[PDB]
């Protein structure tokens, strides 16, 4: 279709590959591209090698695009046997487990973008099925999900992302985090006094 | 035109009368201000020194770039005879009028003034409560009479006589009513300062035989006085004149002490908006004004339908437009009133419209039209409708024995500009009634 | 409460202005103004477009920069088609830079930006600069990506070795290289990378850069600069100028070689000696002896006078005292004068009025 | 054309004026200037009816605004004068009487530094208020200073006065200077007039002062570009050294503090900001011109 | 004028114009960064494309194979337009563009010969990029952490796609091709022209950066400019006299002069006005009275004379005696310049009969004074040094 050609203009495209060595080289190139400032976009698999330990803190991860719920292959004998065993033994519904299995992987990738409280990024989940999965997400992610973002469009979502990126760029007021999100030794002692 | 109009009236006065007019320092102080800044600078420079400076020295002061302003300042200054040019010893010497010099010196140095500015009784009155309403109501009553709207109280015969005797507000007994003229609309279109000068200027000219200098000695002295204070009662002519001025809302009298009003100070020198209005394509007017004066003038050419406290809304109709045009109001004046009383939204949109027009085609700078062109075209087209038929009064000449005679008589009428139409083949032509007598007399000779 | 709301906001605004100390500043400056003209600058976020507004603000910045820094020099660079384009040599003539920017206003921007190319050109242009000058680089970046032929990291290290300082003004979001460039080049300081939040905010950022930047304690270089004060002379006949070789009515005469010049301040074309007037140095004096900020007087105490000392404006009666006093001289002032005395003037009238 | 504000600064101090009379033969010459000033101010009010007048007096112990009088009466002029002229003249003289009375009471106080700089700075603020308040008004500064009294040190007057020059140039406010005393030229005051399209005048004799003011100090801001100023003095835009007190054409200024230095300071260190110069770098300046061997 | 006729050395002329030389060199000495070149090309029956010299060079840099087939066939077999017409129609262009090659496509016979060579090039390129990776992002060790992992094979959705015959569909190859292309671009940037610990640490938890700016306090004290005392009792007498004079009466009418000093004041004021007015009238180059031909010659002499003065002062103030010979040569040139200036005046004097001689001298008076002053300074310093 030629969609990649447009992407090539703005960022370099790095693709995960089954070979471990080649994928490692892609990460090095992806990190190198992000460092200098050339820009790079990495396409990976939610259940792949990148998502099981590789971190994208700060500049490496600024926007995460979860393309669909990472559902397993339903028509698999191994999964079907496991699903039946849980339902009979632990009384867990097959649909409930399937949703939990997919969310646990979608959330996994979302948490590989923030390291400290000075990091920022946008987590977009592109599927109509995520709208009802807010309760299944991690608490620290759910709390940050506004009620108005449950169902968004491409045009509307882009504008919100642009506003968020611009706002976070502004210098943070130190007083806004002196003793509410970051504690010094004196602040810690005060908390130990009020609590006791 | 304010300074020129007042200056022009004084220029036409004979030099003999002008010298007597400068005796009072108060009059000169006002006359000094009206002059151009360059003229004032030179006059004040030479007033304190009893010497004569050649014109060449004065020229040296002016820079080459400002050379043009020097011609206007000297011409205007010399026209009033304030500066007396004396030529002697082969040089065009320059000197100041002795009466003007002494009078100017006295005011600035605190010399004897002979109570030119009046006296103070230390018995003040409330200005806004009494002075403002009295002159405003008196000035509003005449304005309501001027605009033609019915009013319970009508002005006295004095100003009424002045109004009719001027081009202002032509009147006819057979009609039994008074209506504004072309100059009247301009007068109503002038600022308060000029609206006062026009009546005052007419008063100066209309009066016959009371001395002309005494009337100017009071008007200029009137500006010197300050609103909200008493002045004990002065020339004999200034007594009846003071009462006459009382009818124009310039000076307020309790019944022994007279008080100048806000209009008195306006004479000496100058000093969302009320009157701003919105006009739409559908010929509707929405005036964001709360004042009887604005509504009355709008009603002249607007079929106003309703009004609110903050704004007045109406509709422009053929009947209303025809009524106004019948009174002598020109379309150019109407648009000028609309343009100068345009709402900021129209101005802002016009600027945006100009920006869009310039942005698309910046090569040509299109004119800035605050209101839609269709209104301009329709109003102008309606004006053409009234001017659709043209008729002249006169006589038709025919039955010419020889072609030379026809050309001779026809050519003569053309020379004196009394020929309206001619036809060579028919040997016929028509001349205006004004030139009928001249053509007939020429024919006999 | 509405009136109090404005008052408390003024106090919060005054909070930052409280901390003022005479930091050492480099009056002599050499600025390399870099503007980004790429495909990313064709967006309509700034009306009419980013390129038009940036150029317009650039002209204003040039006027302001030379007004308050008469003894400084500036250069203009532009990024176009992935290449760095030079549009004005480093010079002390404000008119030359303004004329160049006006011509640039016509050409449409296109291509991609190249920071490494722009920085490399700036490094070369700043090589022939005296050690006593402060080398500064103002970069206007609008693109979120950079295409460069070489390694940007090496250039950044070279910039640090050359004691160059870089200020970057973004348009859309933060760029990793810009933060690193503004951090490593400014001794780790993170306040030199600024992103505008709206159209109005951009004006303040450009105006802020006018003031000389403070110098680092470790980067301390002290030296004596040789300069001259020419005497203006009026001639009855035009004479050739030593700078442009054109007929002019008159010019300032250099005291070192008597060669005449057209306009000041400029380096003498003959003896290469910087020629200035006493006024030129006087302007930068306020940066050396900044006027201490006035502290608002609490309403609890009793005020001295009902009218301002310097403007004789009656203090409104109205909750919060509308008076500000100067600690040095203890003279109350109205709100209007304090802004005027700290932005237009730079001397407290009360302190001067006090005899000793 | 448009109204203009005239802000006259009067540097009347007991010490300054007293020395002027002894050297001259005009006893009480301050009255002559004061009475002449009254006429000059009246002339300004007579130019137009929309122009205001401001008077600021610089006395020994500080500055005072003679007009307009603070919100916080003797007969010196006949009450038959024009109200506006009288309203300003009477108030001005009334403030003058109070000012002298206060100064006479505090005569014993020891004053060493002139307050001319402070008065100008206050005047600039007042001009901004009047212009800012009313809106499309011009402004002008006129300093009537008696330079006969020898000043202590103008060095500290450079920074304030020079700062006022730039502010005046920013808001297009010409500054006029009139000097009455022995010294023909005031280097710092002259720069104020030249740098802001102003006029500098010096008159040795107080008699006939109105003629100078009316003809030379009456150029309103409206017609400045079309009128050639009568200023005759020529300035050099030079500054005095920091440790020798002599005009320098070519010299050295410390980069850190921009302190002019005619010669290399002793000890190879700045004598003002205590900045140590590199021995190698300074040696370059000390190097003599190259001559063939 | 300064090098051909005057004879100034070329090296000296360029000494003061180093920035000019550098500015021009950098214009043509900079190159754009790497980018995906083949993706930009769009074929847009009849299909037309618009190539450019810049595009041609960029293609070679990113794809050495294209250059290899270009250098060996351009002059030999067919012209460049035919070569690129075949290249785009060939399957090689599709393969290099990271697009799945279609067996149905005919391609070009000549270009197809290099398809096998590209496979060798890719293998060579793979080694050019292969290198040890940091353990932090070493995905190889993650799968080799437990080399005896035995488990159910992943479903076909977690494995590369295959066709009915079981072989790869080839779409994975383009992913590697695109992946290799990105790696090459980054590596090309890093041309000839501890860390892990720092990355893992949380910067936000560290102490906030503290500014280390310097502070200067400047003392204000200097001597006054260098080229009857009244006591308090005397002062107190004046205040009493003025107070008595003010309180008693103040006459504004005395301000008027006696008419004997007014004329003197006016004459003095006018005298300054005449001087000021004369300057004002003559306060794009101003109009000149000299003929056009003479004007250019005067400017040429002024310009060349100024250039010598600039060079003379540079060497005179250089501070190193090694340039003594150059100063002597320049001093002789300056002496010749004075003679040339005198010769021009004599030539103008006789040719124009003194009419333009006065005007000519005035135009070059300031430079003549500067030139003679420079020689006088050189002579005065030279004489003192000699003895
Ligand atoms: Zn020139
Ligand atoms: Zn020189
Ligand atoms: Zn104030
Ligand atoms: Zn203070
Ligand atoms: Zn220093």
From Swiss-Prot, chain A:
Q: What is its main location?
A: nucleus
Q: Which GO terms describe its biological process?
A: nucleotide-excision repair; positive regulation of mitotic recombination; regulation of mitotic recombination; transcription by RNA polymerase II; transcription initiation at RNA polymerase II promoter
UniProt keyword ATP-binding present: yes
Q: Which GO terms describe its cellular component?
A: cytosol; nucleotide-excision repair factor 3 complex; nucleus; transcription factor TFIIH core complex; transcription factor TFIIH holo complex
Q: Could you say what a knockout of this gene produces? A: Essential, it cannot be deleted.
Coiled-coil ranges from the UniProt annotation: none
Cell compartment(s), UniProt? Nucleus
Q: Give the protein's function.
A: ATP-dependent 5'-3' DNA helicase. Component of the general transcription and DNA repair factor IIH (TFIIH) core complex, which is involved in general and transcription-coupled nucleotide excision repair (NER) of damaged DNA and, when complexed to TFIIK, in RNA transcription by RNA polymerase II. In NER, TFIIH acts by opening DNA around the lesion to allow the excision of the damaged oligonucleotide and its replacement by a new DNA fragment. The ATP-dependent helicase activity of XPD/RAD3 is required for DNA opening. In transcription, TFIIH has an essential role in transcription initiation.
Q: What else is known?
A: Present with 14400 molecules/cell in log phase SD medium.
* Family that this chain belongs to: Belongs to the helicase family. RAD3/XPD subfamily.
Q: What is this protein called?
A: General transcription and DNA repair factor IIH helicase subunit XPD/RAD3
Q: Which organism is it from?
A: Saccharomyces cerevisiae (strain ATCC 204508 / S288c) (Baker's yeast)
From Swiss-Prot, chain B:
Q: Domain of life, per the record?
A: Eukaryota
Q: Mind listing the GO molecular function terms for this protein?
A: ATPase activator activity; double-stranded DNA binding
Record-level GO BP terms: nucleotide-excision repair; transcription by RNA polymerase II; transcription initiation at RNA polymerase II promoter
Residues passing through the membrane, by range: none
- Keyword Nucleus assigned: yes
Instruction: Kindly state which keywords UniProt assigns to this record, in alphabetical order.
Output: DNA damage, DNA excision, DNA repair, Nucleus, Transcription, Transcription regulation
Q: Which Gene3D superfamilies match?
A: 3.30.70.2610
Q: Where in the cell is it found?
A: Nucleus
What GO CC annotations are associated with the protein? Answer: nucleotide-excision repair factor 3 complex; transcription factor TFIIH core complex; transcription factor TFIIH holo complex
Coiled coil regions, renumbered to chain: none
Its annotated function is as follows:
Component of the general transcription and DNA repair factor IIH (TFIIH) core complex, which is involved in general and transcription-coupled nucleotide excision repair (NER) of damaged DNA and, when complexed to TFIIK, in RNA transcription by RNA polymerase II. In NER, TFIIH acts by opening DNA around the lesion to allow the excision of the damaged oligonucleotide and its replacement by a new DNA fragment. In transcription, TFIIH has an essential role in transcription initiation.
As a miscellaneous remark, the entry gives: Present with 8900 molecules/cell in log phase SD medium.
Q: What is stated as this protein's family in its record?
A: Belongs to the TFB2 family.
Which NCBIfam families is this protein grouped with?
A: tfb2
Designated name of the protein: General transcription and DNA repair factor IIH subunit TFB2
Curated annotation (Swiss-Prot), chain C:
Which organism's genome codes for this protein? Saccharomyces cerevisiae (strain ATCC 204508 / S288c)
Transmembrane segment boundaries: none
Q: Which GO cellular component term is one of those annotated?
A: transcription factor TFIIH core complex
Sequence ranges assigned to domain VWFA in this UniProt record: 30-209
Other comments on record: Present with 2340 molecules/cell in log phase SD medium.
The signal peptide, as residue positions, is none
- Record localization: Nucleus
Record family assignment = Belongs to the GTF2H2 family.
Zn finger spans (C4-type):
254-271
Job of this protein: Component of the general transcription and DNA repair factor IIH (TFIIH) core complex, which is involved in general and transcription-coupled nucleotide excision repair (NER) of damaged DNA and, when complexed to TFIIK, in RNA transcription by RNA polymerase II. In NER, TFIIH acts by opening DNA around the lesion to allow the excision of the damaged oligonucleotide and its replacement by a new DNA fragment. In transcription, TFIIH has an essential role in transcription initiation.
UniProt keyword terms in alphabetical order: DNA damage, DNA repair, Metal-binding, Nucleus, Transcription, Transcription regulation, Zinc, Zinc-finger
Q: What's the encoding gene here?
A: SSL1
Molecular function in Gene Ontology: ubiquitin protein ligase activity; zinc ion binding
The UniProt entry's GO biological process terms, in alphabetical order, are: nucleotide-excision repair; regulation of transcription by RNA polymerase II; transcription by RNA polymerase II; transcription initiation at RNA polymerase II promoter
Q: What protein does this entry describe? A: General transcription and DNA repair factor IIH subunit SSL1
Swiss-Prot record, chain E:
Q: Which residues form the BSD domain?
A: 45-95
Keyword entries, A-Z: DNA damage, DNA repair, Nucleus, Phosphoprotein, Repeat, Transcription, Transcription regulation
**Molecular function (Gene Ontology), one example:** phosphatidylinositol-5-phosphate binding
An example GO biological process term is: transcription by RNA polymerase I
Tell me, in one coarse class, where this protein mainly resides: nucleus
Q: Which GO terms describe its cellular component?
A: cytosol; nucleotide-excision repair factor 3 complex; nucleus; transcription factor TFIIH core complex; transcription factor TFIIH holo complex
Q: Which part of the entire sequence is included in the shown chain?
A: 197 to 639 of 642
Organism from which the protein derives: Saccharomyces cerevisiae (strain ATCC 204508 / S288c)
- This one is known as General transcription and DNA repair factor IIH subunit TFB1
- What's the stated role of this polypeptide? Component of the general transcription and DNA repair factor IIH (TFIIH) core complex, which is involved in general and transcription-coupled nucleotide excision repair (NER) of damaged DNA and, when complexed to TFIIK, in RNA transcription by RNA polymerase II. In NER, TFIIH acts by opening DNA around the lesion to allow the excision of the damaged oligonucleotide and its replacement by a new DNA fragment. In transcription, TFIIH has an essential role in transcription initiation.
> What's the superkingdom here?
Eukaryota
Provide the protein's localization: Nucleus
Q: What disulfide bonds does the UniProt entry report for this chain?
A: none
Family the UniProt entry places it in:
Belongs to the TFB1 family.
């Amino acid at each position: 279709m030629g969609i990649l050609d447009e992407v090539w203009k703005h960022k370099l495209i790095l693709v995960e590959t089954p070979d471990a060595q080649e994928t490692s080289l892609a990460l090095e190139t992806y990190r190198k591209a992000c460092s200098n400032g050339r820009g790079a976009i990495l396409l990976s698999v939610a259940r792949g090698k990148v998502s099981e330990g590789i971190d994208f803190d700060h500049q490496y991860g600024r926007t995460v695009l979860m393309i669909g719920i990472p559902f397993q292959y339903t028509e698999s004998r191994i999964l079907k046997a496991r699903l039946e065993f849980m339902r009979e033994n632990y009384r867990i519904r097959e649909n409930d487990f399937l949703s939990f299995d997919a969310m646990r992987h979608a959330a996994q990738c979302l948490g590989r973008v923030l390291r400290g409280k000075d990091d920022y990024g946008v987590m977009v989940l592109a599927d109509r099925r995520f709208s009802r999965k807010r309760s299944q997400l991690p608490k620290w992610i759910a709390q940050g999900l506004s009620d108005a973002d449950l169902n968004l469009s491409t045009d509307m979502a882009i504008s919100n992302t642009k506003q968020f990126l611009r706002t976070m760029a502004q210098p943070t007021d130190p007083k806004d985090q002196e003793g509410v999100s970051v504690w010094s030794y004196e602040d810690l002692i005060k908390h130990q006094n009020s609590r006791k | 035109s304010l300074k020129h109009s007042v200056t022009q009236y004084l220029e036409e006065i004979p030099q003999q009368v002008q010298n007597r007019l400068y005796t009072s320092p108060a009059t000169c102080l006002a006359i000094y201000r009206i002059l151009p800044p360059l003229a004032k600078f030179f006059i004040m420079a030479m007033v304190f020194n009893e010497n004569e400076v050649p014109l060449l020295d004065l020229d040296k002061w002016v820079n080459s770039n400002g050379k043009l302003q020097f011609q206007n300042a000297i011409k205007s200054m010399k026209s009033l005879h304030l500066l007396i040019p004396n030529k002697s010893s082969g040089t065009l010497m320059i000197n100041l009028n002795p009466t003007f010099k002494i009078s100017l010196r006295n005011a600035l140095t605190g010399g004897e003034v002979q109570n030119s500015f009046g006296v103070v009784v230390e018995e003040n009155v409330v200005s806004l409560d009494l002075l403002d309403e009295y002159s405003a109501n008196k000035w509003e009553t005449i304005l309501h009479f001027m605009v033609g709207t019915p009013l319970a109280k009508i002005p006295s015969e004095k100003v009424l006589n002045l109004l009719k005797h001027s081009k202002l507000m032509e009147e006819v007994n057979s009609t039994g009513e008074f209506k504004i003229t072309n100059e009247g609309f301009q007068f109503l279109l002038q600022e308060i300062n000029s609206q006062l000068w026009t009546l005052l200027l007419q008063y100066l000219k209309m009066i016959e035989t009371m001395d002309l200098v005494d009337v100017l000695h009071f008007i200029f002295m009137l500006g010197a006085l300050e609103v909200g204070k008493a002045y004990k009662i002065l020339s004999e002519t200034q007594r009846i004149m003071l009462q006459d001025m009382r009818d124009y809302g310039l000076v307020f009298q309790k019944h022994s002490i007279f008080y100048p009003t806000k209009l008195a100070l306006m004479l000496t020198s100058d000093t969302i908006p009320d009157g701003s209005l919105i006009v739409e394509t559908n010929f509707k007017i929405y005036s964001y004004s709360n004042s009887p004066l604005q509504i009355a003038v709008l009603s002249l050419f607007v079929h106003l339908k309703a009004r609110f406290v903050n704004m007045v809304l109406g509709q422009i109709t053929r009947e209303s437009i025809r009524r106004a045009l019948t009174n002598g109001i020109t379309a150019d004046q109407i648009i000028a009133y609309l343009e100068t009383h345009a709402h900021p939204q129209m101005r802002r949109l016009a600027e945006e419209k100009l920006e869009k027009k310039l942005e698309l085609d910046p090569n040509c700078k299109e004119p800035l039209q605050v209101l839609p062109p269709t209104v301009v075209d329709q109003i102008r087209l309606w004006q053409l409708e009234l001017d659709r038929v043209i008729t002249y009064e006169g006589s038709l000449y025919s039955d010419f024995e020889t072609s030379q005679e026809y050309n001779l008589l026809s050519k003569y009428a053309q020379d004196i500009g009394v020929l309206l139409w001619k036809d060579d083949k028919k040997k016929k032509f028509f001349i205006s009634k004004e030139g009928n007598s001249q053509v007939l007399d020429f024919a006999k000779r | 409460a509405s009136l109090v709301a404005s008052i408390v906001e003024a106090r919060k605004k005054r909070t930052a202005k409280k901390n003022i100390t005479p930091y050492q500043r480099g009056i002599i400056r050499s600025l390399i103004l870099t503007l980004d003209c790429s495909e990313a600058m064709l967006e309509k976020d700034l009306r009419p477009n980013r390129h038009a507004m940036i150029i317009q603000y650039a002209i204003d910045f040039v006027h302001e920069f030379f007004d308050q820094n008469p003894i400084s020099q500036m250069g203009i660079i532009i990024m176009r088609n992935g290449l760095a384009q030079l549009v004005s040599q480093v010079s002390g003539n404000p008119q030359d830079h303004i004329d160049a920017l006006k011509s640039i206003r016509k050409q449409e921007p296109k291509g991609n930006p190249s920071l490494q190319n722009a920085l490399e050109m700036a490094r070369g242009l700043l090589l022939p600069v005296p050690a006593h000058c402060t080398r500064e680089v103002l970069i206007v970046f609008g693109s979120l990506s950079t295409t460069d032929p070489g390694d940007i990291h090496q250039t950044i290290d070279s910039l640090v070795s050359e004691k160059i300082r870089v200020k970057v003004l973004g348009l859309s979001a933060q760029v990793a290289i810009c933060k690193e460039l503004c951090k490593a080049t400014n001794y780790g300081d993170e306040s030199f990378y600024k992103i505008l939040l709206d159209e109005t905010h951009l004006k303040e950022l450009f105006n802020e850069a006018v003031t000389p930047l403070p110098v680092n304690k470790i980067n301390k270089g002290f030296t004596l600069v040789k300069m001259g004060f020419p005497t203006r002379i009026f001639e009855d006949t035009p004479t050739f100028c030593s700078c442009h070789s054109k007929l002019v009515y008159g010019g300032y005469f250099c005291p070192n070689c008597h060669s005449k010049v057209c306009s000041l301040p400029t380096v003498c074309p003959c003896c290469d000696l910087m020629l200035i007037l006493s006024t030129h140095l006087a302007r930068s004096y306020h940066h050396l002896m900044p006027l201490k900020t006035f502290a608002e007087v609490p309403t609890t105490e009793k005020f001295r006078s009902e009218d301002c000392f310097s403007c004789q404006s009656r203090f409104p009666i109205l909750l919060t005292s509308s008076r500000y006093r100067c600690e040095d001289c203890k003279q109350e002032f109205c709100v209007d004068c304090d802004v005027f005395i700290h932005e237009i003037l730079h001397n407290c009238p009360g302190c001067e009025s006090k005899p000793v | 054309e448009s109204p203009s504000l005239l802000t006259v600064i009067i540097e009347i101090a007991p010490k300054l004026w007293t020395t002027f009379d002894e050297e001259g033969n005009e006893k009480g010459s301050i009255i002559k200037v004061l009475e002449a000033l009254i006429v000059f101010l009246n002339a300004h009010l007579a130019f137009n009816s929309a122009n205001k007048v401001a008077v600021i007096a610089a006395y020994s112990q500080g500055i005072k605004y003679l007009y307009p009088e603070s919100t916080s009466d003797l007969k010196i002029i006949n009450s038959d004068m024009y109200r506006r002229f009288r309203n300003v003249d009477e108030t001005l003289v009334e403030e003058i009487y109070k000012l002298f009375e206060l100064e006479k009471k505090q005569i014993e106080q020891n004053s060493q530094r002139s307050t001319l700089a402070g008065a100008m700075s206050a005047g600039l603020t007042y001009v901004n208020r009047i212009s800012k308040e009313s809106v499309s008004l011009k402004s002008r500064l006129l300093v009537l200073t008696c330079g006969s009294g020898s000043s202590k040190d103008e060095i500290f007057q450079y920074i304030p006065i020079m700062n006022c020059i730039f502010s005046a140039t920013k808001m297009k406010c010409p500054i006029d200077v009139v000097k009455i005393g022995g010294s023909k030229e005031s280097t710092f005051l002259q720069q104020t007039t030249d740098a802001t399209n102003g006029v500098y005048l010096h008159v040795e004799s107080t008699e006939g002062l109105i003629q100078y003011l009316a003809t030379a100090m009456f150029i309103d801001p409206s017609l400045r570009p079309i009128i050639v100023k009568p200023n005759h003095g020529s300035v050099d835009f030079r500054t005095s050294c920091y440790l020798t007190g002599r005009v320098v054409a070519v010299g050295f200024i410390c980069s850190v503090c921009l302190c002019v230095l005619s010669i290399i300071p002793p000890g190879n260190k700045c004598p003002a900001c205590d900045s140590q110069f590199d021995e190698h770098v300074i040696a370059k300046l000390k190097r003599k011109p190259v001559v063939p061997r | 004028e300064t090098v051909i006729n005057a004879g100034l050395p070329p090296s000296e002329f360029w000494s003061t114009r180093i920035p000019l030389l550098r500015a021009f060199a950098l214009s043509t000495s900079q190159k754009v960064g790497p980018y995906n070149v083949l993706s930009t090309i769009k074929p847009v029956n009849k299909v037309n494309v618009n190539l450019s010299r810049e595009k041609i060079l960029n293609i070679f840099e990113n794809y050495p194979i294209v250059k290899k087939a270009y250098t060996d066939n351009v002059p030999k077999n067919f012209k460049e337009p035919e070569f690129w017409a075949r290249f785009f129609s060939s399957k090689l262009f599709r393969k290099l563009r990271g697009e799945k090659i279609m067996q149905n496509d005919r391609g070009d016979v000549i270009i197809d010969r290099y398809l096998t060579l590209d496979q060798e090039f890719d293998r060579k390129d793979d080694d050019m990029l292969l290198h040890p990776v940091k353990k932090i992002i070493d995905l190889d060790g993650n799968i080799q952490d437990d080399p005896v992992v035995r488990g159910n094979r992943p479903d076909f959705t977690m494995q590369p796609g295959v066709d009915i015959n079981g072989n790869s569909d080839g779409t994975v190859d383009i992913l590697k091709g695109m992946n290799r292309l990105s790696e090459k671009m980054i590596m090309a940037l890093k041309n000839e022209y501890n860390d892990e610990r720092n990355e893992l640490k949380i910067d936000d938890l560290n102490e906030s950066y503290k500014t280390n700016y310097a502070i200067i306090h400047l003392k204000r004290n200097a001597h006054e400019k260098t080229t009857l005392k009244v006591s308090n009792q005397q002062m107190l007498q004046q205040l009493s006299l003025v107070m008595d004079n003010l309180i008693n009466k103040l006459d504004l009418n005395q301000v008027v002069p006696n008419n004997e000093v007014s004329n003197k004041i006016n004459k003095r004021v006018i005298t300054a006005i005449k001087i000021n007015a004369k300057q004002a009238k003559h306060n794009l180059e101003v109009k000149s009275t000299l003929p056009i031909d003479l004007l250019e010659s005067c400017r040429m002499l002024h310009t060349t004379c100024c250039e010598f003065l600039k060079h003379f002062y540079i060497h005179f103030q250089s501070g190193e005696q090694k340039q003594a010979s150059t100063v002597k040569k320049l001093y002789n040139h300056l002496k010749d310049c004075i003679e040339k200036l005198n010769e021009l005046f004599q030539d103008v004097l006789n040719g124009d009969g003194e009419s333009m001689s006065n005007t000519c001298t005035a135009y070059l008076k300031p430079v003549l004074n500067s030139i003679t002053l420079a020689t006088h300074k050189y002579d005065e310093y030279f004489n003192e040094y000699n003895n």
